[PDB]
Amino acid sequence: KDEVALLAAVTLLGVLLQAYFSLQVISARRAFRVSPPLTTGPPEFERVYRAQVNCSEYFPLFLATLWVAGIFFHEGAAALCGLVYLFARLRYFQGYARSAQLRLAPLYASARALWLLVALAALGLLAHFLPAALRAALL
Amino acid sequence: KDEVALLAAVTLLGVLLQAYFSLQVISARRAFRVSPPLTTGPPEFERVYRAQVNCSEYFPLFLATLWVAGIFFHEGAAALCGLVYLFARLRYFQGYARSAQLRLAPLYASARALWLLVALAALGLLAHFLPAALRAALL
Amino acid sequence: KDEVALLAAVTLLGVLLQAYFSLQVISARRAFRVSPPLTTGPPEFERVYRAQVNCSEYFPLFLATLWVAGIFFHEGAAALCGLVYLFARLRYFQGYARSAQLRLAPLYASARALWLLVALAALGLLAHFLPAALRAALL
Ligand SMILES: CCCCCCCCCCCCO[C@@H]1O[C@H](CO)[C@@H](O[C@H]2O[C@H](CO)[C@@H](O)[C@H](O)[C@H]2O)[C@H](O)[C@H]1O
Ligand SMILES: CCCCCCCCCCCCO[C@@H]1O[C@H](CO)[C@@H](O[C@H]2O[C@H](CO)[C@@H](O)[C@H](O)[C@H]2O)[C@H](O)[C@H]1O
Ligand SMILES: CCCCCCCCCCCCO[C@@H]1O[C@H](CO)[C@@H](O[C@H]2O[C@H](CO)[C@@H](O)[C@H](O)[C@H]2O)[C@H](O)[C@H]1O
Ligand SMILES: O=C1CCCC2(CCN(c3cc(OCC(F)(F)F)ncn3)CC2)N1c1ccc(F)c(F)c1
Ligand SMILES: O=C1CCCC2(CCN(c3cc(OCC(F)(F)F)ncn3)CC2)N1c1ccc(F)c(F)c1
Ligand SMILES: O=C1CCCC2(CCN(c3cc(OCC(F)(F)F)ncn3)CC2)N1c1ccc(F)c(F)c1
Ligand SMILES: N[C@@H](CCC(=O)N[C@@H](CS)C(=O)NCC(=O)O)C(=O)O
Ligand SMILES: N[C@@H](CCC(=O)N[C@@H](CS)C(=O)NCC(=O)O)C(=O)O
Ligand SMILES: N[C@@H](CCC(=O)N[C@@H](CS)C(=O)NCC(=O)O)C(=O)O
């Protein structure tokens, strides 16, 4: 509980970020008059809508790495990457709300923080399994 | 294990609910003759299909809040909201299977239970971090 | 930490599998010249793209069952099913990259391993709640 509360706060902030992205896509449906179950519309509606679809798909990938890196490497370091990723996702959504070019940079900034979580999850898991394997192989 | 088994049961029930929604979308593909990878078809096929897409997107948001509220506020109270949300999602799918108007009410009933989980996650995290911050600031 | 490290490794491997599926869909966008936010294109682009959408949707369902079965039944047995599911998903993506028929078999092989995780989660939860219920009812 104590060693996972930063991971739980970054998690809740990520959920609130997804709520923001749903509020924005629901505004574009009223503005461009796009009626459900239609996902097609003007170039800008499809961009705002597509920005949300992508963020939603990446949300469990972010959660999985945040929790694994947080528990196997260091909670504060994984929660720091968790914020960097979530801020890059806000910028990605805001960029896609202007154009597809404008979303490119915050997409690579989010990919950056996501690879950082994967590296910390891998380093933490290797520091757990490897010493015991080195002992078994040498025995 | 003991303090998370209700959260794990509500989780498994949510997975079984997603299995039900996949069984229903696969029935609409045989009924309206919609062949994969096509996601377009009659107004009712797109509605059943779209109801499932939305539920799938919300599933990790539900899981994140259920587990955070369950561990930082109260397991039984978060599992109670977890059932309210899952029942509203069954009604949302059944409503969308009739029309887009008919899905509106169970969608706001699911949003209701989802905001309740977010409030309990926030209250639980504030009860953890705030006393220590009040002590540090006053020291 | 010790009793969840296999579940955390199978989790990280599932994240790396999703990274592979994104690398493949981004290759199809350059090859068939499909520009975002467009999700429509030649029959093969829509198949590679659709294979990824499905995998992404199933990822939290896999994570939920892997962790519940791993903690309530047996970590090694749930991690074994976790690998069977992830290998069937690689084959599903590779099959869909050829045709919709070719994806059918690895889709049922993934459904197989997913039902196995659900059964172990159910058996583990029943072994937890049922003895106490039998005692209460008989008392
Ligand atoms: C397969 C083998 C893997 C090879 C690994 C190669 C590692 C390269 C080592 C270079 C030196 C290490 O660099 C390490 O980076 C981390 C994360 O950015 C730093 O962390 C830093 O974050 C930011 C920079 O983004 C700063 O504002 C902050 O001052 C600091 O905390 C460490 O303070 C630094 O010591
Ligand atoms: C920023 C500050 C936040 C402000 C917070 C304002 C809180 C408002 C307080 C009103 C009184 C509290 O009301 C509290 O609600 C919960 C959840 O619905 C109740 O929980 C209830 O659930 C349902 C009602 O839906 C009943 O069938 C059941 O009898 C009861 O358990 C508590 O029994 C009640 O005490
Ligand atoms: C509602 C009531 C539920 C009814 C449950 C019915 C269960 C049927 C019992 C049949 C016998 C049990 O069969 C049990 O299956 C598991 C999982 O495949 C085996 O596990 C096996 O996996 C693979 C086979 O896929 C083998 O390579 C390996 O040798 C072995 O570990 C057990 O070694 C076996 O004992
Ligand atoms: O579950 C549903 C179903 C219907 C759709 C919504 C309901 C209306 N939404 C908002 C967003 C918002 O933004 C505040 C911010 F951005 F600060 F979070 N404010 C007011 N309504 C967002 C989508 N939703 C939802 C989604 C995620 C959640 F976490 C949640 F709690 C509710
Ligand atoms: O993984 C896959 C890949 C192919 C598609 C399916 C396989 C066929 N489906 C069903 C649903 C059902 O409903 C029983 C209820 F509703 F009680 F759950 N009964 C029989 N088959 C659902 C979709 N699937 C799947 C999905 C989620 C799961 F949890 C799971 F275990 C399997
Ligand atoms: O977050 C984002 C945003 C932009 C898109 C990508 C960035 C480029 N991708 C790849 C994949 C790959 O495959 C190595 C394998 F397959 F071994 F994982 N190699 C090099 N780049 C995958 C999609 N991404 C991403 C997704 C999941 C991750 F886990 C991650 F770390 C990053
Ligand atoms: N994905 C939605 C989440 C919130 C929402 O309103 N969901 C459903 C409510 S039935 C919706 O309107 N989806 C759009 C559609 O059905 O095409 C968004 O980003 O706005
Ligand atoms: N999203 C599916 C999940 C189950 C399923 O059959 N998935 C794939 C199997 S390749 C599918 O048919 N997806 C529809 C498509 O490919 O357009 C549903 O709700 O039916
Ligand atoms: N779903 C993507 C994930 C990686 C990616 O590039 N995501 C966004 C970057 S804005 C994308 O290009 N999505 C396709 C689109 O916007 O239509 C894939 O499988 O390639």
XYZ file of C-alpha atoms and ligand atoms in Angstrom:
678
model
C 0.000 0.000 0.000
C 2.782 2.457 0.974
C 5.119 1.224 -1.836
C 2.366 1.408 -4.518
C 0.496 4.717 -3.676
C 2.567 6.781 -6.188
C 1.750 4.132 -8.888
C -1.932 4.347 -7.837
C -1.922 8.189 -8.092
C -0.274 8.172 -11.573
C -2.902 5.474 -12.474
C -5.863 7.696 -11.299
C -4.371 10.686 -13.145
C -4.228 8.541 -16.317
C -7.921 7.617 -15.840
C -8.789 11.357 -15.419
C -6.790 12.037 -18.620
C -8.960 9.482 -20.484
C -12.085 11.235 -19.095
C -10.739 14.534 -20.553
C -10.226 12.852 -23.985
C -13.820 11.530 -23.919
C -15.146 15.034 -23.028
C -13.234 16.409 -26.047
C -14.490 13.750 -28.507
C -18.078 14.280 -27.260
C -17.632 18.060 -27.946
C -16.528 17.309 -31.566
C -19.695 15.191 -32.089
C -21.881 18.199 -31.157
C -19.714 20.710 -33.083
C -19.370 18.807 -36.426
C -22.840 17.144 -35.891
C -21.416 13.606 -35.955
C -24.086 11.156 -34.729
C -23.304 7.767 -33.107
C -22.594 5.026 -34.244
C -20.801 7.070 -36.938
C -17.035 7.431 -36.530
C -16.518 9.319 -39.893
C -16.817 13.051 -40.451
C -14.756 16.136 -41.364
C -10.913 15.816 -41.380
C -10.699 17.456 -37.939
C -13.424 15.278 -36.322
C -11.685 12.055 -37.488
C -8.424 13.459 -36.033
C -9.830 14.247 -32.565
C -11.725 10.919 -32.567
C -8.621 8.978 -33.722
C -6.428 10.640 -31.080
C -8.775 9.259 -28.386
C -8.920 5.719 -29.904
C -5.097 5.528 -29.838
C -4.837 6.849 -26.283
C -7.394 4.245 -25.101
C -5.443 1.428 -26.755
C -2.203 2.542 -25.100
C -3.748 2.987 -21.653
C -3.386 -0.747 -20.581
C 0.129 -0.866 -22.055
C 0.990 2.194 -19.891
C -0.698 0.630 -16.789
C 1.092 -2.711 -17.203
C 4.598 -1.174 -17.547
C 3.964 1.453 -14.784
C 3.014 -1.237 -12.268
C 5.725 -3.742 -13.264
C 8.530 -1.142 -13.340
C 7.175 0.402 -10.127
C 7.239 -2.901 -8.249
C 10.389 -4.489 -9.760
C 12.673 -1.441 -10.235
C 11.645 1.646 -8.177
C 8.205 3.146 -7.507
C 9.258 6.818 -7.722
C 11.215 6.348 -10.945
C 8.365 4.491 -12.658
C 5.851 7.128 -11.412
C 8.126 9.876 -12.842
C 8.096 8.149 -16.267
C 4.327 7.671 -15.830
C 3.830 11.445 -15.610
C 6.149 12.119 -18.590
C 4.092 9.639 -20.650
C 0.726 11.134 -19.528
C 1.862 14.725 -20.286
C 3.073 13.630 -23.755
C -0.368 12.028 -24.306
C -2.148 15.331 -23.441
C 0.155 17.071 -25.997
C -0.475 14.280 -28.550
C -4.251 14.797 -28.217
C -3.891 18.600 -28.424
C -1.576 18.198 -31.454
C -3.928 15.797 -33.273
C -6.744 18.350 -32.547
C -4.759 20.749 -34.857
C -3.282 18.267 -37.422
C -1.610 14.844 -37.987
C 1.856 16.487 -38.331
C 1.399 18.354 -34.985
C 0.793 15.013 -33.150
C 4.057 13.375 -34.448
C 6.470 14.910 -31.829
C 4.398 14.251 -28.614
C 3.786 10.718 -29.991
C 7.562 10.027 -30.016
C 7.870 11.721 -26.569
C 5.205 9.260 -25.257
C 6.961 6.307 -27.010
C 10.172 7.505 -25.271
C 8.636 7.366 -21.743
C 6.946 4.034 -22.594
C 10.285 2.433 -23.600
C 11.799 3.832 -20.340
C 9.091 1.963 -18.325
C 9.794 -1.232 -20.329
C 13.530 -0.928 -19.626
C 12.951 -0.470 -15.870
C 10.516 -3.428 -15.829
C 13.135 -5.565 -17.675
C 16.031 -4.439 -15.433
C 13.958 -5.128 -12.320
C 12.896 -8.583 -13.496
C 16.478 -9.448 -14.550
C 17.798 -8.365 -11.124
C 15.235 -10.838 -9.612
C 15.636 -13.946 -11.839
C 19.297 -13.658 -12.979
C 21.219 -14.095 -9.642
C 19.295 -17.337 -8.918
C 19.944 -18.611 -12.480
C 23.691 -17.770 -12.222
C 23.753 -19.735 -8.916
C 21.862 -22.746 -10.386
C 24.033 -22.898 -13.546
C 27.245 -22.669 -11.493
C 26.014 -25.302 -8.999
C -5.317 -12.060 -1.128
C -8.145 -11.883 1.460
C -8.512 -8.062 1.081
C -8.568 -8.220 -2.763
C -10.776 -11.338 -3.513
C -13.983 -9.238 -3.920
C -12.060 -6.957 -6.384
C -10.833 -10.113 -8.186
C -14.407 -11.527 -8.431
C -15.854 -8.228 -9.792
C -12.835 -8.252 -12.218
C -13.625 -11.844 -13.465
C -17.315 -10.928 -13.811
C -16.276 -7.929 -15.958
C -14.166 -10.256 -18.161
C -17.190 -12.631 -18.526
C -19.304 -9.569 -19.455
C -16.820 -8.740 -22.257
C -17.073 -12.382 -23.456
C -20.894 -11.936 -23.630
C -20.461 -8.720 -25.715
C -18.133 -10.557 -28.138
C -20.672 -13.433 -28.479
C -23.342 -10.830 -29.349
C -21.208 -8.983 -31.945
C -20.245 -12.332 -33.546
C -24.013 -13.162 -33.796
C -24.663 -9.827 -35.623
C -21.901 -10.682 -38.160
C -23.713 -13.938 -39.059
C -27.197 -12.334 -38.986
C -26.487 -9.195 -41.120
C -23.757 -11.110 -43.114
C -20.989 -8.684 -42.110
C -17.599 -10.194 -43.037
C -14.307 -9.323 -41.267
C -12.341 -7.006 -41.545
C -15.494 -4.964 -42.276
C -16.870 -2.921 -39.376
C -19.673 -1.219 -41.470
C -23.134 -2.595 -42.145
C -26.829 -1.943 -41.426
C -27.725 0.701 -38.765
C -28.340 -2.029 -36.169
C -25.073 -3.937 -36.858
C -22.992 -0.733 -36.433
C -24.876 -0.116 -33.148
C -24.209 -3.567 -31.641
C -20.595 -3.429 -32.899
C -20.099 0.128 -31.543
C -21.563 -0.814 -28.148
C -18.842 -3.490 -27.813
C -15.990 -1.157 -28.944
C -16.975 1.368 -26.240
C -17.282 -1.274 -23.524
C -13.799 -2.619 -24.403
C -12.286 0.866 -24.189
C -13.844 1.461 -20.769
C -12.828 -1.926 -19.368
C -9.244 -0.835 -18.280
C -10.622 2.441 -16.900
C -13.081 0.362 -14.798
C -10.284 -2.071 -13.709
C -7.905 0.735 -12.706
C -10.479 2.603 -10.548
C -11.918 -0.654 -9.045
C -8.486 -1.767 -7.846
C -7.311 1.665 -6.638
C -10.564 2.468 -4.792
C -10.671 -1.099 -3.446
C -7.167 -0.893 -1.992
C -7.104 2.775 -0.865
C -10.715 3.308 0.324
C -12.645 0.055 1.038
C -12.769 -3.230 -0.894
C -16.498 -3.920 -0.382
C -17.556 -0.398 -1.335
C -15.458 -0.395 -4.514
C -16.743 -3.913 -5.408
C -20.340 -2.653 -4.907
C -19.698 0.223 -7.363
C -17.982 -2.312 -9.655
C -21.207 -4.330 -9.908
C -23.353 -1.199 -10.456
C -21.026 -0.203 -13.323
C -21.043 -3.726 -14.877
C -24.873 -3.982 -14.698
C -25.200 -0.531 -16.334
C -22.832 -1.760 -19.091
C -25.057 -4.831 -19.762
C -28.052 -2.419 -20.034
C -26.017 -0.051 -22.260
C -25.234 -2.935 -24.650
C -28.866 -4.135 -24.615
C -30.044 -0.531 -25.184
C -27.632 0.087 -28.083
C -28.892 -3.261 -29.558
C -32.322 -1.484 -29.886
C -31.219 2.135 -30.664
C -28.771 4.994 -29.850
C -31.430 6.792 -27.722
C -32.071 3.593 -25.664
C -28.338 3.405 -24.704
C -28.206 7.032 -23.345
C -29.628 6.301 -19.812
C -27.508 3.174 -18.924
C -24.479 5.109 -20.277
C -25.018 7.867 -17.664
C -25.710 5.172 -14.998
C -22.287 3.615 -15.860
C -20.619 7.093 -15.851
C -22.222 7.580 -12.392
C -20.653 4.388 -10.916
C -17.331 5.204 -12.643
C -17.177 8.679 -11.022
C -18.022 7.009 -7.649
C -14.934 4.732 -8.045
C -12.789 7.783 -8.944
C -14.023 9.642 -5.851
C -13.231 6.681 -3.557
C -9.776 6.289 -5.165
C -9.142 10.051 -4.639
C -10.444 10.043 -1.035
C -8.323 6.994 -0.221
C -5.172 8.476 -1.744
C -5.776 11.835 -0.001
C -6.228 10.064 3.362
C -2.772 8.451 2.715
C -0.675 11.412 1.445
C -2.377 14.404 3.160
C -1.655 13.707 6.903
C 2.090 13.329 6.146
C 2.073 16.547 4.055
C 0.224 18.476 6.826
C 2.903 17.218 9.283
C 5.825 18.165 6.966
C 4.428 21.655 6.200
C 3.794 22.343 9.902
C 7.255 21.036 10.890
C 6.997 -9.833 -5.418
C 8.416 -13.397 -5.520
C 4.944 -14.968 -6.115
C 4.050 -12.490 -8.918
C 7.364 -12.164 -10.935
C 6.327 -14.857 -13.490
C 2.980 -12.974 -13.970
C 4.983 -9.726 -14.360
C 7.304 -11.314 -16.992
C 4.370 -12.747 -19.034
C 2.798 -9.225 -18.684
C 5.970 -7.464 -20.067
C 6.177 -10.023 -22.893
C 2.535 -9.214 -23.770
C 3.401 -5.477 -23.850
C 6.396 -6.235 -26.171
C 4.002 -8.280 -28.360
C 1.713 -5.218 -28.668
C 4.780 -3.118 -29.643
C 5.502 -5.678 -32.427
C 1.866 -5.392 -33.684
C 2.158 -1.574 -33.780
C 5.466 -1.826 -35.737
C 3.677 -4.081 -38.262
C 0.626 -1.798 -38.682
C 2.941 1.231 -39.108
C 4.788 -0.721 -41.888
C 1.448 -1.354 -43.712
C 0.681 2.414 -43.607
C 3.958 3.149 -45.455
C 3.590 0.174 -47.848
C -0.075 0.703 -48.946
C 0.282 4.540 -48.453
C -2.504 4.702 -45.852
C -2.427 8.123 -44.141
C -3.747 8.778 -40.598
C -6.540 9.280 -39.474
C -7.630 6.852 -42.225
C -8.272 3.266 -41.127
C -9.535 2.075 -44.610
C -7.401 0.820 -47.473
C -6.660 -2.313 -49.532
C -8.063 -5.682 -48.284
C -4.673 -6.613 -46.794
C -4.130 -3.261 -44.989
C -7.573 -3.497 -43.296
C -6.653 -7.072 -42.249
C -3.301 -6.176 -40.641
C -4.885 -3.079 -39.041
C -7.906 -5.087 -37.783
C -5.665 -7.815 -36.339
C -3.972 -5.155 -34.163
C -7.286 -3.538 -33.039
C -8.541 -6.944 -31.820
C -5.294 -7.787 -30.032
C -5.382 -4.405 -28.223
C -8.964 -4.993 -27.081
C -8.088 -8.433 -25.711
C -4.930 -7.269 -23.938
C -6.729 -6.079 -20.686
C -8.910 -9.206 -20.707
C -5.682 -11.290 -20.863
C -4.028 -9.162 -18.096
C -7.041 -9.408 -15.773
C -7.359 -13.229 -16.038
C -3.536 -13.783 -15.898
C -3.249 -11.854 -12.633
C -6.406 -13.274 -11.008
C -5.629 -16.899 -11.951
C -1.977 -16.357 -10.994
C -2.844 -15.088 -7.519
C -5.896 -17.276 -6.729
C -4.944 -20.605 -8.388
C -1.190 -20.976 -9.157
C 1.310 -18.472 -10.575
C 3.227 -20.941 -12.782
C 0.083 -22.473 -14.265
C -1.438 -19.082 -15.097
C 1.917 -17.899 -16.571
C 2.014 -21.079 -18.728
C -1.478 -20.281 -20.101
C -0.326 -16.657 -20.516
C 2.435 -17.764 -22.900
C 0.094 -20.102 -24.838
C -2.317 -17.170 -25.305
C 0.471 -14.739 -26.374
C 1.932 -17.240 -28.898
C -1.560 -17.832 -30.364
C -1.926 -14.027 -30.683
C 1.372 -13.781 -32.656
C 0.022 -16.551 -34.973
C -3.372 -14.783 -35.204
C -1.642 -11.562 -36.331
C 0.579 -13.453 -38.805
C -2.498 -15.343 -40.095
C -4.599 -12.179 -40.519
C -1.567 -10.679 -42.397
C -2.220 -13.435 -45.044
C -6.070 -13.712 -44.902
C -9.204 -13.815 -42.668
C -9.440 -17.644 -43.012
C -5.763 -18.056 -41.919
C -6.478 -16.160 -38.635
C -9.449 -18.435 -37.628
C -7.376 -21.311 -36.059
C -4.936 -19.209 -33.894
C -8.003 -17.172 -32.801
C -9.632 -20.326 -31.342
C -6.232 -21.366 -29.855
C -6.104 -17.947 -28.074
C -9.783 -18.299 -26.971
C -8.784 -21.748 -25.602
C -5.954 -20.353 -23.395
C -8.193 -17.426 -22.347
C -10.962 -19.790 -21.134
C -8.255 -21.804 -19.263
C -7.239 -18.602 -17.365
C -10.926 -17.890 -16.577
C -11.390 -21.431 -15.240
C -8.307 -21.159 -12.987
C -9.455 -17.722 -11.740
C -12.933 -19.195 -10.988
C -11.536 -22.337 -9.296
C -9.187 -20.219 -7.186
C -11.925 -17.808 -6.121
C -14.321 -20.696 -5.345
C -11.646 -22.405 -3.206
C -11.417 -19.078 -1.245
C -15.109 -18.123 -0.757
C -16.840 -21.557 -0.756
C -15.400 -23.187 2.453
C -16.416 -20.110 4.512
C -19.917 -20.114 2.939
C -20.344 -23.879 3.616
C -19.347 -23.184 7.266
C -21.746 -20.195 7.609
C -24.706 -22.054 6.027
C -24.121 -25.111 8.240
C -23.725 -22.949 11.376
C 22.017 -3.465 -22.389
C 22.775 -2.547 -21.394
C 21.988 -1.240 -21.098
C 22.887 0.021 -21.247
C 22.426 1.176 -20.313
C 23.140 2.515 -20.658
C 22.881 3.602 -19.574
C 23.594 4.943 -19.907
C 24.230 5.590 -18.643
C 24.356 7.136 -18.781
C 24.371 7.852 -17.400
C 23.099 7.540 -16.564
O 22.195 8.666 -16.630
C 21.091 8.617 -15.696
O 19.838 8.894 -16.381
C 18.717 9.137 -15.505
C 17.385 9.171 -16.305
O 17.491 10.094 -17.400
C 19.024 10.405 -14.668
O 17.807 10.922 -14.082
C 17.666 12.339 -14.322
O 16.415 12.716 -14.948
C 16.406 14.055 -15.521
C 17.040 13.986 -16.933
O 16.056 13.490 -17.856
C 17.117 15.135 -14.642
O 16.312 16.326 -14.618
C 17.453 14.668 -13.185
O 18.474 15.532 -12.658
C 17.887 13.174 -13.025
O 17.212 12.602 -11.889
C 20.166 9.987 -13.710
O 20.538 11.013 -12.775
C 21.405 9.649 -14.574
O 22.429 9.162 -13.695
C -15.083 17.973 -1.906
C -15.879 17.455 -0.679
C -16.747 16.215 -1.036
C -18.212 16.375 -0.541
C -18.867 15.004 -0.209
C -20.401 15.137 0.014
C -21.014 13.830 0.595
C -22.547 13.953 0.827
C -22.985 13.295 2.167
C -24.469 12.828 2.128
C -24.748 11.663 3.120
C -23.842 10.430 2.844
O -24.608 9.419 2.150
C -23.968 8.125 2.057
O -24.022 7.632 0.690
C -23.658 6.244 0.539
C -23.498 5.872 -0.962
O -24.673 6.259 -1.693
C -24.678 5.388 1.332
O -24.614 4.009 0.899
C -25.926 3.486 0.605
O -26.057 2.916 -0.721
C -27.431 2.724 -1.163
C -27.952 4.065 -1.738
O -27.450 4.217 -3.077
C -28.393 2.181 -0.056
O -29.223 1.151 -0.619
C -27.671 1.663 1.234
O -28.628 1.635 2.307
C -26.399 2.459 1.677
O -25.358 1.531 2.036
C -24.385 5.693 2.821
O -25.178 4.915 3.734
C -24.696 7.189 3.065
O -24.326 7.496 4.417
C -17.571 -28.069 -13.282
C -16.517 -29.156 -12.942
C -15.219 -28.983 -13.779
C -14.777 -30.318 -14.443
C -13.236 -30.391 -14.634
C -12.823 -31.587 -15.540
C -11.284 -31.818 -15.524
C -10.862 -33.014 -16.423
C -9.759 -33.883 -15.751
C -8.887 -34.631 -16.801
C -7.468 -34.965 -16.259
C -6.699 -33.692 -15.808
O -5.733 -33.331 -16.822
C -4.777 -32.321 -16.422
O -4.686 -31.282 -17.435
C -3.576 -30.377 -17.267
C -3.698 -29.163 -18.230
O -3.890 -29.621 -19.577
C -2.264 -31.194 -17.388
O -1.146 -30.308 -17.631
C -0.347 -30.759 -18.745
O -0.151 -29.764 -19.779
C 0.326 -30.298 -21.048
C -0.894 -30.822 -21.847
O -1.554 -29.705 -22.465
C 1.420 -31.406 -20.909
O 2.460 -31.163 -21.872
C 2.024 -31.545 -19.470
O 2.638 -32.841 -19.361
C 1.029 -31.327 -18.283
O 1.652 -30.497 -17.286
C -2.223 -32.078 -16.118
O -1.020 -32.856 -15.997
C -3.424 -33.053 -16.185
O -3.446 -33.800 -14.960
O -18.017 6.589 -18.102
C -18.323 7.519 -18.838
C -19.549 7.247 -19.688
C -20.076 8.452 -20.486
C -18.846 9.260 -20.941
C -17.988 9.818 -19.755
C -18.861 10.889 -19.025
C -18.503 12.367 -19.336
N -17.083 12.669 -19.200
C -16.673 13.727 -18.458
C -15.331 14.110 -18.370
C -14.984 15.187 -17.555
O -13.650 15.585 -17.472
C -13.166 15.791 -16.140
C -11.657 15.488 -16.133
F -11.132 15.719 -17.372
F -11.054 16.279 -15.196
F -11.470 14.178 -15.818
N -15.938 15.835 -16.859
C -17.223 15.446 -16.935
N -17.569 14.397 -17.706
C -16.133 11.758 -19.814
C -16.823 10.551 -20.506
N -17.614 8.693 -18.841
C -16.474 8.723 -17.989
C -15.216 8.388 -18.507
C -14.066 8.290 -17.713
C -14.175 8.566 -16.363
F -13.107 8.524 -15.588
C -15.418 8.893 -15.821
F -15.483 9.125 -14.517
C -16.575 8.967 -16.614
O -10.743 -14.963 -26.777
C -11.698 -15.076 -27.535
C -11.306 -15.220 -28.993
C -12.460 -15.551 -29.954
C -13.700 -14.793 -29.443
C -14.147 -15.220 -28.003
C -14.654 -16.696 -28.102
C -16.196 -16.873 -28.103
N -16.870 -16.159 -27.026
C -17.757 -16.802 -26.225
C -18.495 -16.142 -25.238
C -19.359 -16.879 -24.429
O -20.110 -16.228 -23.451
C -20.080 -16.847 -22.160
C -20.267 -15.744 -21.102
F -20.979 -14.708 -21.634
F -20.916 -16.275 -20.023
F -19.044 -15.283 -20.723
N -19.464 -18.211 -24.602
C -18.736 -18.840 -25.541
N -17.885 -18.141 -26.318
C -16.502 -14.774 -26.793
C -15.379 -14.285 -27.748
N -12.986 -15.097 -27.066
C -13.131 -14.910 -25.662
C -13.355 -13.623 -25.156
C -13.402 -13.339 -23.785
C -13.249 -14.385 -22.894
F -13.327 -14.166 -21.594
C -13.016 -15.674 -23.371
F -12.849 -16.644 -22.482
C -12.944 -15.952 -24.747
O 4.271 4.184 -27.595
C 4.460 4.092 -28.802
C 4.070 5.336 -29.576
C 4.463 5.334 -31.064
C 4.294 3.888 -31.569
C 5.217 2.856 -30.836
C 6.689 3.197 -31.233
C 7.325 2.267 -32.300
N 7.179 0.847 -32.005
C 8.257 0.024 -32.033
C 8.154 -1.358 -31.846
C 9.313 -2.132 -31.850
O 9.220 -3.513 -31.679
C 10.128 -4.062 -30.718
C 9.472 -5.312 -30.105
F 8.601 -5.863 -31.000
F 10.451 -6.204 -29.770
F 8.780 -4.948 -28.992
N 10.512 -1.542 -32.024
C 10.602 -0.210 -32.184
N 9.491 0.551 -32.165
C 5.867 0.367 -31.606
C 4.814 1.505 -31.523
N 5.004 2.963 -29.357
C 5.263 1.896 -28.450
C 4.299 0.898 -28.264
C 4.431 -0.124 -27.315
C 5.581 -0.162 -26.549
F 5.763 -1.131 -25.671
C 6.554 0.826 -26.708
F 7.629 0.767 -25.936
C 6.407 1.864 -27.644
N -15.303 7.052 -26.837
C -16.217 8.064 -26.240
C -16.423 7.785 -24.749
C -17.632 8.500 -24.123
C -18.926 8.239 -24.858
O -19.762 9.125 -25.010
N -19.109 6.980 -25.273
C -20.154 6.541 -26.184
C -21.536 6.652 -25.559
S -22.720 5.454 -26.218
C -20.123 7.260 -27.531
O -20.774 8.286 -27.715
N -19.357 6.700 -28.466
C -19.336 7.182 -29.826
C -20.076 6.241 -30.759
O -20.900 5.457 -30.232
O -19.822 6.303 -31.975
C -15.636 9.465 -26.453
O -14.399 9.560 -26.551
O -16.454 10.417 -26.519
N -14.397 -7.817 -31.190
C -14.874 -9.210 -31.412
C -14.148 -10.180 -30.477
C -14.255 -11.660 -30.877
C -13.821 -11.926 -32.300
O -14.412 -12.739 -33.005
N -12.731 -11.263 -32.703
C -12.259 -11.181 -34.077
C -11.764 -12.525 -34.588
S -10.489 -12.382 -35.862
C -13.293 -10.598 -35.037
O -14.079 -11.327 -35.639
N -13.276 -9.273 -35.168
C -14.095 -8.591 -36.141
C -13.266 -8.090 -37.310
O -12.153 -8.639 -37.489
O -13.734 -7.175 -38.010
C -16.387 -9.274 -31.186
O -16.882 -8.445 -30.400
O -17.022 -10.156 -31.818
N -2.325 1.674 -33.433
C -0.970 2.079 -33.899
C -0.054 2.355 -32.705
C 1.217 3.151 -33.042
C 0.936 4.450 -33.760
O 1.665 4.850 -34.664
N -0.115 5.143 -33.305
C -0.711 6.292 -33.968
C 0.220 7.495 -33.969
S -0.653 9.078 -34.004
C -1.187 5.991 -35.388
O -0.447 6.164 -36.354
N -2.437 5.540 -35.493
C -3.073 5.346 -36.774
C -4.105 6.425 -37.049
O -3.996 7.490 -36.396
O -4.987 6.190 -37.894
C -0.385 0.976 -34.786
O -0.772 -0.188 -34.577
O 0.441 1.330 -35.665
